[PDB]
Design a protein around this nucleic acid. Structure first.
Lengths: 246, 173, 302, 302
DNA sequence: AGGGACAAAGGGCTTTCCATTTATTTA
DNA sequence: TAAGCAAAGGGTTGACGAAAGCCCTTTGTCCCT
């Protein structure tokens, strides 16, 4: 018996927009699907799928150039090189109002799930962002598509994200169809021989390259299937959709 | 071509289709993946402080190797082993994980640490495909700052910067 | 011992601010609120450039983003939130070892002074830097975990002890000393004058149309969150020849001024970590600075 | 040797005038303030350029924004607030040894006559730029911190000495020489004649239908704040062949005349600073020029 | 038993190499 | 319903450089008298 928990109108601030060197703005679906593993490890509630919209979104900067804060001098080897401003490499940030849906199985009363996601919101960060204000979470129960439409009518207004798929490759598809790409998976390239520079020192580490896909921004009152809008872990080191390609 | 390739191997001598130099200039990590290279794919180029010798028209090594699969006719091997072996002596693997993002993924019953590094073809095909064929929703960036020629020779060559897509959805009125 | 530092070290930020929002209210009825709409005006001035005296008899009209209070209201309302997160001793990159022998070497420091300076810097109005300048009467309202405090006048430059701020200092020092979270919703009110000029954060941009662009939320005036976090970060009065508080930087350099105090005189961060790791007893006025760096966050090279 | 300005040396505004508003009043009664509004009329004049003598029989037409006193009232009222801020010398951006060596070489200026010329420019009503002409009598009232003064006649080109400007000059000179701010809420009354024409500040229009659009806040005629702050500082009388009190700028540049009055003859502000930081003796009437440009603003580049 | 050499390891400062489109342009 | 909808003058400048090379100093490592 599946359960849905909803984070509505969460104000994210300081979220770095650089999903890749070629996609900037929204963080990839790896971020919001790893949020589920973050509450699966930090809290313990098993999250199987995730979906997200956007009440508002804006990347910090002007119309053709969005850009980056003056960097600090937080490196060793720059002793006399501190009076100058910074070495500045691009890292644009954003701010947005989001809606989040998590697929969880609880097998317990709903008065614990709300507090157990509330105290996790206050300690986690949304891709480097800072939560300012967020509505109180509530638990939704749906057993069919008719009761899943009750979940559909309550996110009004938002702009949800559905998969769209690539025709041949990235920028060609971005041109002729005028759609939006974003990263949906990672391809292993080479294994680092030494683990003394890792943050875990036990798990083997491989270099990765971002694999992209096309999506669609849709009105939440006009989507046929929510499972077309949910996202989850895939294979290998990829994400996908329950409902497949729209 | 032979004299400046010889200058390149006498220099630092690194070619690559994947790097983390674009995320931070302090990267020094370089891998030439093999199976993803197709006929129209493009490759960037690094030597120390972006040095080189022109080909008597102000033309360095990059547009040379980049211009319409020029590299392919040496990589597939119709130009002889004499050029191809000296080309293959330059594509080495260089590993470095400092000042790079280091994230996790849920694999089969466990988690996996992996470093996201950037792609070579995507930036150059972005500068040459969102621009020429009229896509009118993009952000123009320049990396690095006032001295962008520190990263690569791709960084050195065009100073208008690369192009990303806009990820701004329309908002509720 | 005689062990070497990690070549890279990562620290999470434990002061997470939210971006400021700007509203216009009157000084009596604060309920009638409206957002300060950022407009674009175009100003015709002189060249006024250093050197270049030949072309100094020519104009230069450029578009500047401006943000003014409307002339029906004389009060600038600010609104944002601050989160303080406990367990500041967990290194992101860095599992421990070097981190652990610094963590247990920094258990007997003064968390309360840092907490009081943080909440005093946000209480006094350092988070504003130009809208405080010229206000007839400032006031601050802080709502934290269902209790509300109100401050009227504080000296920003000098840290003066008072009983109203010490409770917030202890209530965030308890989270800072151990583990947890504490979130405070902060509002500022300024009597500036009828239709005065406000100063939001300006963006880093080489914009071809706008010369000076003020930050916006769909047109509403707003500051940067890290602009706020810089002022809460601004505590450092422990460098040599100290006269004014500066931001926590590992080399003690602020880049607006273009000088460096703590760098290059056996005072900066990367010497003090090597001192504290290798068993040297630190100066009793240095250890709260080291702590500060951490809470501000930061990567650290080799 | 030499000390140079920092690559970045920015000097923030020490005057903050609000954008003035234009109202319609009578002369004997000043309480029924009714907004003079920006209306859009259309002219059908002549094609008359210095060139193109062939096009001299074909009439041009554009829509212009006009603002008049309505035909029941005979006085124009101009309402603004001006905040004279202190902390004059502290460099906002920049600020090391070219902000402090300037402090030790510029503490003995004449702030009193500086403030006298600034409050005289408000009091004599040079802040209107066109509404002085066609006016019988002007009455400028200034309110500072609950006290009100009224000015009838002051010939603006020669800064005369009186007693009702001088104490406000003492307040403003005390507030620039130290810390703080002083707010002048100023109202200008001009009996322009019955139903006459007022002149608000025109905006830049970048390829618009309106060939002449005045500044507008909420449908109503207004003048630019930087135009007011231009006309506070028309005090410069220490240039070559000293004549009119022109606006004070680093090259002494009026862009209407197209000639800079302080450029290219070793008299500009920039020049008049590198000697000061290097330690040369600055005279009594040009360090006041330097201080007037400190309280103007600008960038002081490399 | 301890200063002096033998040499690695950090560290400040010193060049450097650039040349393409400068985008246009908003739903 | 018809005929005709202007001209000049300018549009800022300042910080935003990693890696090889070149010396300078310091402290692991080893030495006898």
């Amino acid at each position: 018996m599946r359960k849905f928990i909803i984070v509505k109108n969460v104000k994210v601030d300081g979220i770095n927009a650089k999903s890749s060197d070629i996609t900037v703005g929204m963080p990839p679906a790896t971020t919001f699907c790893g949020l589920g593993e973050t509450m699966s490890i930090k809290t313990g509630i098993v999250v199987k799928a995730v979906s997200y919209g956007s009440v508002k979104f804006e990347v910090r900067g002007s119309r053709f150039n969005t850009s980056v804060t003056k960097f600090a001098w937080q490196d060793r080897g720059n002793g006399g090189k501190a009076n100058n401003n910074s070495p500045i490499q691009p890292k644009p940030l954003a701010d947005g109002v989001f809606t989040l849906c998590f697929e969880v199985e609880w097998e317990d009363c709903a008065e614990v799930l709300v507090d157990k996601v509330t105290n996790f919101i206050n300690t986690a960060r949304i891709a480097g962002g800072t939560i300012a204000s967020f509505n109180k979470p509530f638990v939704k129960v749906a057993k069919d598509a008719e009761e899943l439409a009750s979940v559909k009518n309550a996110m009004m207004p938002c702009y949800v994200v559905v998969d769209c798929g690539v025709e041949v490759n990235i920028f060609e598809d971005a041109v002729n169809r005028k759609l939006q790409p974003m990263v949906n998976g990672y391809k292993k390239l080479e294994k680092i021989v030494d683990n003394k520079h890792m943050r875990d020192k036990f798990t083997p580490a491989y270099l990765a390259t971002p694999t992209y896909t096309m999506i669609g921004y849709k009105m939440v009152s006009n989507v046929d299937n929510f499972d077309q809008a949910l996202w989850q872990y895939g294979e290998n080191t990829k994400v996908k959709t329950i409902g497949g390609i729209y | 071509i032979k004299e400046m390739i010889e200058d390149f191997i006498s220099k630092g001598g690194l070619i690559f289709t994947h790097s983390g130099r674009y995320t931070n200039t302090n990267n020094s990590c370089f891998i030439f993946n093999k199976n993803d290279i197709g006929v129209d794919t493009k490759v960037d180029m690094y030597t120390p402080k972006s040095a080189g010798i022109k080909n008597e028209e102000g033309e360095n090594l990059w547009q040379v190797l980049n211009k319409a699969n020029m590299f392919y006719r040496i990589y597939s091997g119709e130009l002889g082993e004499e050029l191809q072996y000296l080309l293959k002596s330059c594509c080495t693997a260089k590993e470095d994980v400092t000042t790079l993002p280091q994230i996790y993924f849920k694999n089969g019953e466990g988690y996996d640490i992996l470093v996201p590094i950037g792609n070579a073809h995507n930036l150059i095909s972005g500068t040459e495909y969102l621009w020429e064929h009229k896509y009118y929703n993009t952000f123009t960036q320049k990396l690095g700052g006032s001295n962008p020629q520190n990263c690569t020779h791709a960084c050195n060559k065009m100073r208008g910067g690369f192009k990303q897509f806009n990820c701004t959805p329309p908002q509720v009125e | 011992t005689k062990l070497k530092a990690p070549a890279v070290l990562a620290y999470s930020r434990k002061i997470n601010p939210t971006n400021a929002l700007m509203f216009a209210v009157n000084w009596s009825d604060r309920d009638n609120t409206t957002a300060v709409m950022v407009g674009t005006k175009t100003v015709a001035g002189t060249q006024s450039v250093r050197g270049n005296p030949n072309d100094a008899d020519k104009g230069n009209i450029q578009t500047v983003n401006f943000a003014n209070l409307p002339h029906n209201k004389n009060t600038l309302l600010v609104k944002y939130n601050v989160k303080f997160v406990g367990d500041v001793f967990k290194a992101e990159l860095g599992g421990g070892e070097y981190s652990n022998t610094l963590q247990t070497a920094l258990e007997n420091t003064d968390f309360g002074t840092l907490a009081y300076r943080y909440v005093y810097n946000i209480a006094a109005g350092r988070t504003l830097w130009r809208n405080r300048v010229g206000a007839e009467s400032i006031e601050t309202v802080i709502t934290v975990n269902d209790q509300t405090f109100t401050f009227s006048d504080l000296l920003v430059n000098e840290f003066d002890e008072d009983v109203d701020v010490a409770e917030i200092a202890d209530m965030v020092a308890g989270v800072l000393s151990g583990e947890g979270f504490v979130t405070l919703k902060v509002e500022h009110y300024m009597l500036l004058g009828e239709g005065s000029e406000v100063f939001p954060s300006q963006e880093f941009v080489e914009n071809s149309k706008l010369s000076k662009q003020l930050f916006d939320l769909n047109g509403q005036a707003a500051m940067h969150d890290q602009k706020i976090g810089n002022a809460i970060r601004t505590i450092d009065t422990w460098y040599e020849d100290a006269t004014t508080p500066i931001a926590v930087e590992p080399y003690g350099s602020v880049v607006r001024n273009g000088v460096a105090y703590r760098a290059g005189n056996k005072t900066d961060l990367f010497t003090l970590m090597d001192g504290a790791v290798n068993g040297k007893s630190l100066t009793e006025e240095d250890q709260m600075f080291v702590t500060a760096n951490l809470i501000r966050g930061g990567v650290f090279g080799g």
